[PDB]
Amino acid sequence: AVKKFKPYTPSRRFMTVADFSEITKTEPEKSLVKPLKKTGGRNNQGRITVRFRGGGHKRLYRIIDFKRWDKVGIPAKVAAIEYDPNRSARIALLHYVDGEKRYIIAPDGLQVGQQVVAGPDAPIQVGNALPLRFIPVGTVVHAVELEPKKGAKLARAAGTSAQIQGREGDYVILRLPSGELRKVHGECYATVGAVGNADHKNIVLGKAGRSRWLGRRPHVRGAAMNPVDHPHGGGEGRAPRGRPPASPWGWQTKGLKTRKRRKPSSRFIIARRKK
Amino acid sequence: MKRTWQPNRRKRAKTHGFRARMRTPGGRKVLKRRRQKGRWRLTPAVRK
RNA sequence: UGGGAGAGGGUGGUGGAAUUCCCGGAGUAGCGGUGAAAUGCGCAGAUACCGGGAGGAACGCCGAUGGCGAAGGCAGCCACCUGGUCCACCCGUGACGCUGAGGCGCGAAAGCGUGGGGAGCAAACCGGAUUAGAUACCCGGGUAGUCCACGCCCUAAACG
RNA sequence: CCGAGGGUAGGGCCCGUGACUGGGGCGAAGUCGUAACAAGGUAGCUGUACCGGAAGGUGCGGCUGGAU
RNA sequence: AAAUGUUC
RNA sequence: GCGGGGUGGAGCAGCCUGGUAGCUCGUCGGGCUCAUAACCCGAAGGUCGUCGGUUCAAAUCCGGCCCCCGCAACCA
RNA sequence: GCCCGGAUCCGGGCACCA
RNA sequence: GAGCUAGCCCUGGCCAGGGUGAAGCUGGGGUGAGACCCAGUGGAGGCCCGAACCGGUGGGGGAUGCAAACCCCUCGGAUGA
RNA sequence: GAAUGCCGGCAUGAGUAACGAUAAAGAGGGUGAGAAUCCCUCUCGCCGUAAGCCCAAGGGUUCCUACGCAAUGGUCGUCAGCGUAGGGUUAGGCGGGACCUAAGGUGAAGCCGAAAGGCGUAGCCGAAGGGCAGCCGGUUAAUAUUCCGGCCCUUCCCGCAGGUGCGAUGGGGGGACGCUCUAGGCUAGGGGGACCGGAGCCAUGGACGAGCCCGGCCAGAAGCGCAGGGUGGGAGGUAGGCAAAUCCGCCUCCCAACAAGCUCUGCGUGGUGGGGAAGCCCGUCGGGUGACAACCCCCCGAAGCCAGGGAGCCAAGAAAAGCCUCUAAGCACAACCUGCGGGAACCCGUACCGCAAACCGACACAGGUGGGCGGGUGCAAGAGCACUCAGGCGCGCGGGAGAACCCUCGCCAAGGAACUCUGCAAGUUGGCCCCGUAACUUCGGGAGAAGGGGUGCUCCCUGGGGUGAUGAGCCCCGGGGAGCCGCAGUGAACAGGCUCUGGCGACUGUUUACCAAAAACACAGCUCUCUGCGAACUCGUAAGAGGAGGUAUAGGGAGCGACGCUUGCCCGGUGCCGGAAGGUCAAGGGGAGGGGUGCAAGCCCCGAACCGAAGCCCCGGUGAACGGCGGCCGUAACUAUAACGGUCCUAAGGUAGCGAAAUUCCUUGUCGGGUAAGUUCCGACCUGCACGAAAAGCGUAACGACCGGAGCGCUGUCUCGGCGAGGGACCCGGUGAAAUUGAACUGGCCGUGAAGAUGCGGCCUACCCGUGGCAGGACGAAAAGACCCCGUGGAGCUUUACUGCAGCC
RNA sequence: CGAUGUCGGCUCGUCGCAUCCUGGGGCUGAAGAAGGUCCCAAGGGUUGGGCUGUUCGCCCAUUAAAGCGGCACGCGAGCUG
Ligand SMILES: CC(=O)c1cccc(N[C@H]2[C@H](N)[C@@](NC(=O)N(C)C)([C@H](C)O)[C@@](C)(O)[C@@]2(O)COC(=O)c2c(C)cccc2O)c1
Ligand SMILES: [K+]
Ligand SMILES: [Mg+2]
Ligand SMILES: [Mg+2]
Ligand SMILES: [Mg+2]
Ligand SMILES: [Mg+2]
Ligand SMILES: [Mg+2]
Ligand SMILES: [Mg+2]
Ligand SMILES: [Mg+2]
Ligand SMILES: [Mg+2]
Ligand SMILES: [Mg+2]
Ligand SMILES: [Mg+2]
Ligand SMILES: [Mg+2]
Ligand SMILES: [Mg+2]
Ligand SMILES: [Mg+2]
Ligand SMILES: [Mg+2]
Ligand SMILES: [Mg+2]
Ligand SMILES: [Mg+2]
Ligand SMILES: [Mg+2]
Ligand SMILES: [Mg+2]
Ligand SMILES: [Mg+2]
Numbered sequence A: 001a002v003k004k005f006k007p008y009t010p011s012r013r014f015m016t017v018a019d020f021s022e023i024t025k026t027e028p029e030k031s032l033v034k035p036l037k038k039t040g041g042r043n044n045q046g047r048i049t050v051r052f053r054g055g056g057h058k059r060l061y062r063i064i065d066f067k068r069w070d071k072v073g074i075p076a077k078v079a080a081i082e083y084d085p086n087r088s089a090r091i092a093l094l095h096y097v098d099g100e101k102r103y104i105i106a107p108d109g110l111q112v113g114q115q116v117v118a119g120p121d122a123p124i125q126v127g128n129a130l131p132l133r134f135i136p137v138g139t140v141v142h143a144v145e146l147e148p149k150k151g152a153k154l155a156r157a158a159g160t161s162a163q164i165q166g167r168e169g170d171y172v173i174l175r176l177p178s179g180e181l182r183k184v185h186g187e188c189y190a191t192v193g194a195v196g197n198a199d200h201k202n203i204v205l206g207k208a209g210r211s212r213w214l215g216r217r218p219h220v221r222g223a224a225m226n227p228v229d230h231p232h233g234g235g236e237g238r239a240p241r242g243r244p245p246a247s248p249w250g251w252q253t254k255g256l257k258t259r260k261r262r263k264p265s266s267r268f269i270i271a272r273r274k275k
Numbered sequence B: 001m002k003r004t005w006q007p008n009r010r011k012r013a014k015t016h017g018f019r020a021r022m023r024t025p026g027g028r029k030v031l032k033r034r035r036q037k038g039r040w041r042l043t044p045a046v047r048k
Numbered sequence C: 001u002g003g004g005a006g007a008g009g010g011u012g013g014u015g016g017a018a019u020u021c022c023c024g025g026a027g028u029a030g031c032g033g034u035g036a037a038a039u040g041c042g043c044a045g046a047u048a049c050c051g052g053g054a055g056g057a058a059c060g061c062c063g064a065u066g067g068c069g070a071a072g073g074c075a076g077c078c079a080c081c082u083g084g085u086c087c088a089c090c091c092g093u094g095a096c097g098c099u100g101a102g103g104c105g106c107g108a109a110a111g112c113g114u115g116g117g118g119a120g121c122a123a124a125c126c127g128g129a130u131u132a133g134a135u136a137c138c139c140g141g142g143u144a145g146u147c148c149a150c151g152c153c154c155u156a157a158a159c160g
Numbered sequence D: 001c002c003g004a005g006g007g008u009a010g011g012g013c014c015c016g017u018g019a020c021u022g023g024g025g026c027g028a029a030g031u032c033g034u035a036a037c038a039a040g041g042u043a044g045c046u047g048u049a050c051c052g053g054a055a056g057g058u059g060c061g062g063c064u065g066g067a068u
Numbered sequence E: 001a002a003a004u005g006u007u008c
Numbered sequence F: 001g002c003g004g005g006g007u008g009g010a011g012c013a014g015c016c017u018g019g020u021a022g023c024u025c026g027u028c029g030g031g032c033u034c035a036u037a038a039c040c041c042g043a044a045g046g047u048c049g050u051c052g053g054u055u056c057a058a059a060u061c062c063g064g065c066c067c068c069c070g071c072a073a074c075c076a
Numbered sequence G: 001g002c003c004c005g006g007a008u009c010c011g012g013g014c015a016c017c018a
Numbered sequence H: 001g002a003g004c005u006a007g008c009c010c011u012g013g014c015c016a017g018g019g020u021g022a023a024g025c026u027g028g029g030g031u032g033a034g035a036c037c038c039a040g041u042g043g044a045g046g047c048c049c050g051a052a053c054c055g056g057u058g059g060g061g062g063a064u065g066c067a068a069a070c071c072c073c074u075c076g077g078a079u080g081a
Numbered sequence I: 001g002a003a004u005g006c007c008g009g010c011a012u013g014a015g016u017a018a019c020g021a022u023a024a025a026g027a028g029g030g031u032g033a034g035a036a037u038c039c040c041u042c043u044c045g046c047c048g049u050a051a052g053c054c055c056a057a058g059g060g061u062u063c064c065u066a067c068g069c070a071a072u073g074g075u076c077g078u079c080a081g082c083g084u085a086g087g088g089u090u091a092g093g094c095g096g097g098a099c100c101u102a103a104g105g106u107g108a109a110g111c112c113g114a115a116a117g118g119c120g121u122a123g124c125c126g127a128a129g130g131g132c133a134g135c136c137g138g139u140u141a142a143u144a145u146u147c148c149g150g151c152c153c154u155u156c157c158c159g160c161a162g163g164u165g166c167g168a169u170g171g172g173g174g175g176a177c178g179c180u181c182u183a184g185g186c187u188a189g190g191g192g193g194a195c196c197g198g199a200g201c202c203a204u205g206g207a208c209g210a211g212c213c214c215g216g217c218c219a220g221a222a223g224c225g226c227a228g229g230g231u232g233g234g235a236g237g238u239a240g241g242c243a244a245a246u247c248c249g250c251c252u253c254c255c256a257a258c259a260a261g262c263u264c265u266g267c268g269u270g271g272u273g274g275g276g277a278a279g280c281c282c283g284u285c286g287g288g289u290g291a292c293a294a295c296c297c298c299c300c301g302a303a304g305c306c307a308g309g310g311a312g313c314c315a316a317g318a319a320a321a322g323c324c325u326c327u328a329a330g331c332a333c334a335a336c337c338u339g340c341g342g343g344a345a346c347c348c349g350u351a352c353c354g355c356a357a358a359c360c361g362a363c364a365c366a367g368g369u370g371g372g373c374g375g376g377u378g379c380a381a382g383a384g385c386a387c388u389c390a391g392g393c394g395c396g397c398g399g400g401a402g403a404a405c406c407c408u409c410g411c412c413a414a415g416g417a418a419c420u421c422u423g424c425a426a427g428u429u430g431g432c433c434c435c436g437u438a439a440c441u442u443c444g445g446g447a448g449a450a451g452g453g454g455u456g457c458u459c460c461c462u463g464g465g466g467u468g469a470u471g472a473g474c475c476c477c478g479g480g481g482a483g484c485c486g487c488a489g490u491g492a493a494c495a496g497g498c499u500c501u502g503g504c505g506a507c508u509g510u511u512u513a514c515c516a517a518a519a520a521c522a523c524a525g526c527u528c529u530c531u532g533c534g535a536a537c538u539c540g541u542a543a544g545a546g547g548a549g550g551u552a553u554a555g556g557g558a559g560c561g562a563c564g565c566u567u568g569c570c571c572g573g574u575g576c577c578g579g580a581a582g583g584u585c586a587a588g589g590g591g592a593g594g595g596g597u598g599c600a601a602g603c604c605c606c607g608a609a610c611c612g613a614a615g616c617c618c619c620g621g622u623g624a625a626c627g628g629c630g631g632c633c634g635u636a637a638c639u640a641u642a643a644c645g646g647u648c649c650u651a652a653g654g655u656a657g658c659g660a661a662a663u664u665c666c667u668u669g670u671c672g673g674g675u676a677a678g679u680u681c682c683g684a685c686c687u688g689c690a691c692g693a694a695a696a697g698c699g700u701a702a703c704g705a706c707c708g709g710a711g712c713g714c715u716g717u718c719u720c721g722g723c724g725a726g727g728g729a730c731c732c733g734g735u736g737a738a739a740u741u742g743a744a745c746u747g748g749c750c751g752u753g754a755a756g757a758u759g760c761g762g763c764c765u766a767c768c769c770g771u772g773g774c775a776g777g778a779c780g781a782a783a784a785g786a787c788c789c790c791g792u793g794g795a796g797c798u799u800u801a802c803u804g805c806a807g808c809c
Numbered sequence J: 001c002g003a004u005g006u007c008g009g010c011u012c013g014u015c016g017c018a019u020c021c022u023g024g025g026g027c028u029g030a031a032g033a034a035g036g037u038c039c040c041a042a043g044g045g046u047u048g049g050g051c052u053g054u055u056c057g058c059c060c061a062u063u064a065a066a067g068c069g070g071c072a073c074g075c076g077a078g079c080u081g
């Protein structure tokens, strides 16, 4: 579930935190962590290129295995389920019978101590990874590759999933978490089941400070600025937009589609997203 | 109150130093310029 | 002890008919709708027809003056978990009973909260009619909602 | 010491009264509609919700104290 | 089709 | 100061582009109804705010004047 | 200004303006 | 030119004392089981009071100043954005 | 001769202001030409979580000694951070380097860019992080973990012995990590002692006392003891740790696991080496003595040590080397490990200041400057507050006087906000313990609500804890009586005034460095929208980055702004979205038909229909997209008003809720409340000049150095002022500015004058020159008015101004 | 316009008189008392408060009376702001 607080401070009145029920190991695998290089939203020119970023808790990167097809037929045991501060999803620690240890994102229903495997021959079971073409049409699926051997790109967020809708040649048809209908190549791997920690979105940050812990610096409205800064800048007292609502760089921000029309992947998207 | 000059030897040598100047087209033009004017010091003095 | 009938309840799963939308084919001058019409939809190729797809909701015939439950109420089909209940036998306990202010639970619909879901339907709402008017009845649209999970609300011509 | 009571401070119940406001009752022959009673000219009532000058309408579910 | 009918 | 207006009883056309004033309602006379409303058939009523001027002719074009809406009235 | 349009002239279509 | 200032990055450091007493846990009560109630334990928090530290609210002084922004009295934050 | 001209020089203001914290001085004795100012002594005051002491920046000889006083020093100077000179900084162990990585920087390979250059995996560089071997004392005028003395330790090289498959930049382990809280045991540090050691002291009424006063330790190898950290052992299998591996990882079996063993730290002890006071002597910083100094017991006790300890929590907490292990080439007369021995051990820093007179502030400048130590007592605690130890200071002009006035301070009869824009300011209140505490509420709160009582000292009785031993002592919480004193017991210092009621913002936060701290920004939360990943978006010509080693429960953009209850109608215009038709549509295609030239083949030019994208037109959608949400006339059996109607217009005519409002012009609307009196305030009404629903609407507990209104308390705010204090002002000695200044021999009135006259006219008044004072004038000073206009002057900003460009299509 | 600081308050006044009071008068539709109205008169006097930034004004309570106006709408090298 999601844990609440009594209002013993103003902020604690609404703050909710994850329950951390599923977490079985409270420190990572030392040989699976490298330092995460905090950027502050700055690129190699030293320029902010994504505004309002920096100052969050220090983190260690946990190396996640987004291939899995790396180890076909070598089963693994789910040793523990751990916190990962770099993603919404929990991660599961795999002890391969090989003796290799790797991380995966923890699907919903994974129980520590169970056994998973990857490959065409694998059982259609929560935690296993197969190429899409060998997965029954209709099963829920996460950590999906988008092109063969290129890595799991789709459905990795807490609670998310994709569902296989049908097949057509070398391609299967997935419904992405967004509701889009895309053709994804059949030889692309995917782990059956949905990603765990579905309660993640029910979390109320509760106070300004919590956002700051997440490295999210305060966002300031255009309307709060001056004409030098933003299309919505200036005006005497409060002002309505007074033009079509715009980004700091001038382009319209209410409805203006921005996916490039002539994208080569257009042939593969059947139906643009849901709501 | 805290004023603008806050001496720091490493800062001084790394910013205005001989090697910093030589490392850049502008810096070399400075050195060229101060040599042409015949400055006694091409670069700010600093005790390392 | 042994047997019974049943839409009693909860969970999981699954089947076909229909409506809608989408894709393909084929086809053309209207379709729809009413008291009559208009709005609406249609040569930007609609209706009607065939194939494929997606999704949600309700389960036709059986079906009854029927069955079950304390009441609200419960209807495709399968399994699981579970309540009541009747009958046979005349085996066991020996009045252990009845009712029940408070208390506790349950309680159709609508409604509310947080997430999902959204085909059909449809408060509000828009339009077309009717009309003296028509903030209505009729027609074309259409949002909550109707559906699921969890938590509230605790009303009723909750009636025999 | 206790002590009538006086004084200070803060509560509780009650009563009178108050600009204005909310509906209620009553008032021989005001204004607008015609919701209900005959299938009352859309059967009615109903709990609820939303809406509308007003009666009321509509959705959802119920009831017959309805159909003939 | 068809709204309404002053009071005792 | 600048723009717009004034026409049957009411609310609005016509003016720009001179000659011929129109629409809904109201009012009046008939019908229908026991009667009333609605409905149906017919009809009256504006010399166009006022006074000037232009024109053969002015609701109409042009000037004053009387009203009536609107907008402005800022810098110390 | 010219060409493409309809029942000399309104349609319009593009373009020019010292 | 970022030795001032603004943001971020890496790596260290600092925050007297006192107050309030969340969750949890234990025991008791409760019930079919529960919820839940009670006491104890516990030690949460952009929680409270208040130094250092960071501020700069009001007033007064200063105004060729001690000072090109300072001093005094007050006053804000002070485990956190 | 003028340019607020330029450079220089010298005047005026002027013996004026000032001489830089109000912590404070007095005397005696030295020195010297000269002394308030230098040295010495005594007395006095100031700091003492410093105004004392270590360290790091930065500074760069300022350090020490001799000799100086021209200048520097806000005065003086014999003195000095000043002048001249001489001296002074000593390391294998401290800091940095010959070690390691962090961001970042650089950069074989590689990528990009007219040039210059930009990037870039490894690698290299990069520290206040990791790693690493020295502690105590003595010595110098000046250095000392550096020299010396004692006791210790590290690496490198060689050698001897013992031992082993030795061997690396490769594999693995370890290094290696957060926040808050916290156990045990120690140490640093502290308090006490009737015990130990000590020069002495008995005063002024008393005390020869268990009197007073001083001191009662520091370092220490191995071993030992205590306290802690780290850590399983064995076997078999093996496909993983880009080769190999006996290591590591995974599987199995065995044994044992709040132990132990092994190992490493801390602390104690410890051969030994040091230290060692008051006092009064000699000094004038130190010495000698004390002294064979003593070197003990009890208590308090860390935030520090064992430390990589423990628990809980979520926001989930560097790297790399040293080090250990595994093997690879290799090599196994080698090599490594262990013990011992001999030898070897480099470069740079080291003075001094360092919360300041030596750093940053032009100054010996009331400002700024990171880390550690920071004693005692008492006040609940404490780094707070008062006093005080060690130690350091009296702030580099003084002496007087005792005016106005100013500053900072103290008290005040009666009154008590009557002050004023405003209780501005200053009173009041004030800590702790106990009693007690309302509306409302989101059940936390509002709370320190409000309000009240207590508080010292003495004696008697007594409860529990720590330490020890279960006792004595010491220490820590209490409880109960009976008393004493004073005006008063947190007797000094430090330490809330309270309440009622509105506006705005939910809240903690943030902001215009240096006139605005707020109602502004942020904020959790809500919604819209874009984005399928080589994402969108952003920075860049690009490469490349950020986004993100993320993936729609995610990322960008926008508005709104906890929460509650809500968020209506308009899609005609603009925006965005959808629409394979139609309309227009550029280059290009096409080439009917015409032309220039040529004797000609030919060469060359113009060129219609038709084909031909996006965009625009056109058809729809869309409001938490830009935005918009009417007018006139009539009507109720009293008046008044209009539920109702008529009609024009609109894309549609403002719903709920609010309303004279941070919005109301008229306006101090009207009425009600509060006041003796209320342009403010609160509650209402509604013809809302000109509220209204995410530029959100109406509410909202709590919160606020926000802005209103009111009451109690208390006051020098005031009636209305008085007195007192200190620092200035004043006088004397020392030093001695400034802006300003056409020149000046610079009066009043009434006139006149370019319209406000010391300067002109007429009259009047007036001996010459100062000092303290006050500010009416000199259209006083300052600043080439910042308002306004002007200039075909400039810049920032905007858009459906013009015209380009990037970007996108 | 190479600067004449701008409302209101406060403080300090000083002048005018078209006199608010006090003093002296005439006329009165002046019985007395008390008023009206004009004349003479500037010596003195001319209050405290509620509201507002206010001047002004209204209001409370008084008063003999609660005067009006000039002085750069007197007065910021006097203060306030
Ligand atoms: C049969 C006949 O004459 C006729 C004509 C036209 C229409 C109709 N049918 C119906 C009329 N249009 C009516 N119904 C309707 O339109 N439907 C599609 C059912 C309307 C909603 O009110 C009705 C209920 O009034 C109606 O049933 C009769 O009422 C009147 O018509 C009506 C009213 C209400 C007032 C005056 C006249 C009328 O006709 C009937
Ligand atoms: K102006
Ligand atoms: Mg909560
Ligand atoms: Mg969780
Ligand atoms: Mg690592
Ligand atoms: Mg870089
Ligand atoms: Mg760079
Ligand atoms: Mg950005
Ligand atoms: Mg950023
Ligand atoms: Mg996670
Ligand atoms: Mg974070
Ligand atoms: Mg914002
Ligand atoms: Mg702004
Ligand atoms: Mg800018
Ligand atoms: Mg702009
Ligand atoms: Mg704007
Ligand atoms: Mg603005
Ligand atoms: Mg603004
Ligand atoms: Mg505005
Ligand atoms: Mg605007
Ligand atoms: Mg807006």
Ligand SMILES: [Mg+2]
Residues within 6 Å of the ligand: A241, A242, A243, I626
């Ligand atoms: Mg606009």
Ligand SMILES: [Mg+2]
Residues within 6 Å of the ligand: A231, A243, A244, A245, A246, A250, A251, A252
């Ligand atoms: Mg725009």
Ligand SMILES: [Mg+2]
Residues within 6 Å of the ligand: A178, A180, A271, A272, A273
């Ligand atoms: Mg999509």
Ligand SMILES: [Mg+2]
Residues within 6 Å of the ligand: B005
């Ligand atoms: Mg400077």
Ligand SMILES: [Mg+2]
Residues within 6 Å of the ligand: B006
């Ligand atoms: Mg600095």
Ligand SMILES: [Mg+2]
Residues within 6 Å of the ligand: B008, B009, B010, B011
């Ligand atoms: Mg340096």
Ligand SMILES: [Mg+2]
Residues within 6 Å of the ligand: B010
């Ligand atoms: Mg440095």
Ligand SMILES: [Mg+2]
Residues within 6 Å of the ligand: B008, B010, B011
């Ligand atoms: Mg530096």
Ligand SMILES: [Mg+2]
Residues within 6 Å of the ligand: B013, B014, B015, B016, B017, B018, B019, B020, B021
């Ligand atoms: Mg350099």
Ligand SMILES: [Mg+2]
Residues within 6 Å of the ligand: none
């Ligand atoms: Mg070169």
Ligand SMILES: [Mg+2]
Residues within 6 Å of the ligand: none
């Ligand atoms: Mg030079």
Ligand SMILES: [Mg+2]
Residues within 6 Å of the ligand: B040
């Ligand atoms: Mg030279």
Ligand SMILES: [Mg+2]
Residues within 6 Å of the ligand: B016, B021, B030, B031, B034, B042, B043, B044
């Ligand atoms: Mg240089």
Ligand SMILES: [Mg+2]
Residues within 6 Å of the ligand: C043
């Ligand atoms: Mg066609």
Ligand SMILES: [Mg+2]
Residues within 6 Å of the ligand: C055
């Ligand atoms: Mg669907």
Ligand SMILES: [Mg+2]
Residues within 6 Å of the ligand: none
């Ligand atoms: Mg019963």
